[PDB]
Symmetry: C3
Subunit: 231 residues, 3 copies
């Protein structure tokens, strides 16, 4: 484990995702509202999945070597197995908050799968220049997601209860800022141009992951928007 | 790229799926009917997924070598990753058109997963004679799907609006004819008996894919069956 | 095939899953109740999936070698591909029986995915002591599932029709007893401590699989709880 300088950030990430999972699990014990139960189930699964994948990276299972640039490059593939399941769950939290229609939910989840799937292909591609073709396709899929979150959901939240509109607006802004950083870290990190070393890259993804999952969840599950209007 | 004679058909397929995706995306911009939005989302995702997998084959990522018959045989595995997601989406288009019940939808999607999954196992199997055992199981799963589309959905469409009944009947006939060709191309192509060479096999799958996805989508999204009855 | 002593139990399992699939398929022909169709579709898919994965193990495709303990250990990875899809389908049978809320269904299916996913990682892990870390995480996920089936569903079934309450109680008890045996067989078998040899381990999993899928299905599909109350 300790033979890799980035191990400290993988261990911290593992701990923070595990602690986040347990807090949400305990906090959700005393909840019977069927609407609130939906948000607790979605939001608790997110850091639980991330916990297992951070642990796999810490123990060395989620790491492979990819030859490109005449070098064997360490690629943590477990990140994409994490994101494949956690990013659509996070979008479902937002879509259920605004009572989005089914067709829009399917478009979001499908574009998200394309985003993560093409990012994985780009991470494992051995022809250096082709890695950035996949990065560009994946980034186009992300821009579609961000467009929908702004010019489809925002207008839908305003016609909703005030507390669900204000909570959505906050979580929307958090998501757009944090998610946009991921393609940048990829491009300048060891998967892309190799400007930033792997140990610093790992620290950046850990800060982003914890903020986008645990921080996101703390804002959502403390809001009254997750409960139905009741007397 | 150009070192493979089949590259021209992979490049054409990539272009036609990309163009198809963009047309459906633009055409769906001016749509607010929640029913129509469902069909546009399903139908636009189909060629978008196929685009990415054709590109992976063009660039050489979606290709592996499988030893059988005393030879290293080029097997494009990316086809099955495509079909795993696009064939159930196409069946969902048909099932939603006739307002199929949930139990029937689950049976269709499950049989479809078995069809594609066993076809993938057959494509990667190293014992030559066993490849055709998997082909037979996969073909049995397809025949179940075709039976349901005829002796379960057809009777349901007649009790529906006339425009949804006539549109379903057309898309049903297109699907049964085109899908039935796939097991035949597999059997006589490089995955099976090896009668037809890979470059011709690739041309045939490209014609079938574009027809079953883009051609299918053009018929559906030009129909009024996708809109609810409104004044 | 016959070069492996466990082949006899893989062949028996294949036959019993295939026969089970055909019986459920025939029995479900004469069913039009939309509620009953749901249970028949879920319950017939379970042994059909298991059939294909037992066949892959029989023919040698679903087997790999994992080095640990200074030895190349035969690991049947196809079991986890089976369980990944069949265990959530079995939980869906139970959840639909008691009309569970959506949030609870998602929590069950998500915990089940974590259970199977971490068990697969543990089966393929090359550092011997780490294999049991994954076993423990997977077992914690199972205990969560069992808790929900007892202290969330049981109370919900009592407020239901008497026949659905008594049928659920029976299937609940069958599930908790049979599922609990799996982590024990893993721990003492070739994936874990290696006390029980592989051929005996394979026999035990076959008895458990057939009972948990075909036996489970025979109890459910003979009950009147799967039909709506009708005159
Ligand atoms: C009902 O809706 C509320 C349940 O949602 C919340 C239910 C959760 C979604 C269930 C998923 C958690 C499982 C219990 C998994 C247990 C293993 C975890 C990874 C444990 C990690 C923390 C600890 C080991 C440090
Ligand atoms: C509606 C939305 C959900 C739609 C989703 C969008 C999606 C279509 C976007 C594209 C996804 C696609 C790129 C997934 C590729 C997975 C692949 C990286 C797995 C590893 O295989 C890659 C190479 C080794 O580098 O295999 C070496 C050769 C091996 C012999 C490969 C044989 C196994 C194949 C991988 C079998 C295909 C399985 C499916 C891809 C499983 C789904 C994985 C997940 C990442 C989507
Ligand atoms: C709301 O419902 C309508 C949206 O459906 C339609 C929405 C679509 C389903 C969203 C999926 C498309 C994404 C925007 C993916 C973008 C990358 C594409 C693969 C681009 C391919 C064409 C071009 C690069 C040649
Ligand atoms: C309700 C419906 C959706 C049900 C679906 C029906 C489905 C059950 C039908 C059978 C599907 C099954 C054959 C999928 C097999 C995937 C497999 C080809 C992936 C590549 O692995 C094959 C060998 C190399 O040749 O791995 C070499 C050895 C490696 C060490 C393998 C270890 C990884 C395992 C593959 C882990 C299992 C992952 C799941 C199979 C992922 C789903 C893939 C998709 C193709 C279903
Ligand atoms: C409508 O709801 C009822 C259909 O459910 C029941 C429908 C089933 C869920 C459909 C799935 C079965 C498919 C027909 C697959 C056929 C291949 C099987 C694996 C055959 C195995 C048995 C035989 C080959 C020994
Ligand atoms: C809501 C719920 C459904 C959530 C589900 C819970 C889930 C997150 C729990 C953890 C699942 C995770 C451990 C799955 C790992 C699959 C992995 C074993 C496949 C084989 O790859 C392992 C190594 C060889 O040993 O690959 C060698 C290196 C290769 C180069 C690997 C590159 C391919 C990657 C495997 C791509 C990721 C694909 C996804 C993991 C596909 C889903 C598989 C299924 C088992 C979940
Ligand atoms: C909890 C994890 C989250 C919210 C991860 C989000 C990840 C992304 C938005 C990743 C995007 C990428 C691109 C847009 C292209 C480059 C490759 C990716 C996958 C890093
Ligand atoms: C857009 C792609 C489509 C509609 C693909 C359809 C593919 C099939 C219907 C494939 C069927 C197969 C068999 C029936 C057995 C032989 C292997 C397959 C997977 C080619
Ligand atoms: C039809 C198959 C069924 C119902 C299989 C159930 C399997 C389990 C409940 C497996 C549980 C495991 C653990 C709890 C940890 C050890 C590894 C597993 C996956 C065997
Ligand atoms: C979206 C965030 C990207 C900003 C990356 C900042 C990295 C600064 C760290 C110093 C770079 C290390 C280079 C010298 C080793
Ligand atoms: C009462 C609110 C705080 C509860 C404690 C939460 C502990 C989980 C770890 C959170 C750290 C990361 C927060 C986002 C920066
Ligand atoms: C379902 C369509 C299958 C028909 C295949 C027709 C192939 C004819 C092309 C000529 C065969 C090439 C053999 C000589 C190289
Ligand atoms: C107005 C209808 C035609 C629009 C142009 C569609 C261009 C997408 C490519 C379609 C070619 C394949 C059609 C099926 C044979
Ligand atoms: C949950 C069931 C686990 C019980 C396992 C009993 C196995 C007894 C078979 C004899 C053990 C073989 C050891 C000598 C070869
Ligand atoms: C009339 C009920 C029996 C029908 C025959 C079922 C045959 C399928 C194989 C069942 C054997 C396994 C039963 C569970 C132990
Ligand atoms: C194995 C991959 C299957 C999933 C394909 C994605 C489409 C799923 C459609 C689900 C239809 C709704 C069923 C109720
Ligand atoms: C990782 C594979 C999980 C999918 C298994 C297929 C069954 C899914 C059941 C979904 C139940 C409906 C939830 C609302
Ligand atoms: C185009 C939709 C408007 C909202 C999206 C904001 C774009 C942020 C740019 C992200 C940069 C990634 C490289
Ligand atoms: C048996 C259901 C009737 C409709 C299915 C038509 C069968 C077409 C044969 C396809 C040939 C594939 C080898
Ligand atoms: C803790 C929830 C109560 C019901 C679960 C029964 C636990 C059975 C123990 C299984 C042993 C697996 C190692
Ligand atoms: C080795 C660098 C080659 C540059 C390729 C950049 C491709 C980016 C595509 C974005 C449209
Ligand atoms: C090398 C050819 C061996 C023939 C096997 C055919 C199997 C087909 C099974 C269809 C029932
Ligand atoms: C080689 C045996 C090492 C023992 C590790 C046991 C780990 C079990 C963790 C359960 C909390
Ligand atoms: C609940 C605390 C979980 C912390 C265990 C993971 C941290 C790795 C320490 C080496
Ligand atoms: C929108 C046009 C997309 C065409 C790019 C793919 C074709 C491959 C050319 C080499
Ligand atoms: C319907 C009977 C299915 C039996 C075939 C599988 C058994 C393997 C025999 C070698
Ligand atoms: C993106 C930063 C999240 C901050 C988490 C703190 C929330 C406390 C209510
Ligand atoms: C299967 C052939 C499809 C033909 C596509 C043309 C549709 C234009 C309305
Ligand atoms: C767990 C044992 C199941 C027994 C199956 C027999 C059911 C006949 C109704
Ligand atoms: C009005 C809410 C502002 C939230 C933005 C937070 C950016 C990290
Ligand atoms: C909408 C604000 C985008 C912020 C992008 C930050 C990328 C590091
Ligand atoms: C009555 C519609 C006929 C459609 C069949 C088209 C076959 C390619
Ligand atoms: C229902 C007509 C089937 C046509 C099969 C064509 C196979 C090449
Ligand atoms: C295995 C075939 C079953 C025969 C019919 C059983 C009575 C519905
Ligand atoms: C009251 C029903 C008892 C069922 C338990 C069966 C254990 C195999
Ligand atoms: C609730 C009874 C548990 C039985 C466990 C059996 C494990 C072999």
């Amino acid at each position: 484990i300790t033979g890799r300088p980035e191990w400290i950030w993988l261990a911290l990430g593992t701990a923070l995702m595990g602690l986040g999972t347990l807090y949400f699990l305990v906090k959700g014990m005393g909840v019977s509202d069927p609407d609130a139960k939906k948000f607790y189930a979605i939001t608790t699964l997110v850091p639980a999945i991330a916990f297992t994948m951070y642990l796999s990276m810490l123990l060395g299972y989620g790491l492979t070597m990819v030859p490109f640039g005449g070098e064997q490059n360490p690629i943590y593939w477990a990140r994409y197995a994490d994101w494949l399941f956690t990013t659509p769950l996070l979008l479902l939290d937002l879509a259920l908050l605004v009572d989005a229609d089914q067709g829009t939910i399917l478009a979001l989840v499908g574009a998200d799968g394309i985003m993560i799937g093409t990012g994985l292909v780009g991470a494992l591609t051995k022809v250096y220049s082709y890695r950035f073709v996949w990065w560009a396709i994946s980034t186009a899929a992300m821009l579609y997601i961000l467009y929908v979150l702004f010019f489809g959901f925002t207008s839908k939240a305003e016609s909703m209860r005030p507390e669900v509109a204000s909570t959505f607006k906050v979580l929307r802004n958090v998501t757009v800022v944090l998610w946009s950083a991921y393609p940048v870290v990829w491009l300048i990190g060891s998967e892309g141009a190799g400007i930033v070393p792997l140990n610093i890259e790992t620290l950046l993804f850990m800060v982003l992951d914890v903020s986008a999952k645990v921080g996101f969840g703390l804002i959502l599950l403390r809001s009254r928007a997750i409960f139905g209007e009741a007397e």
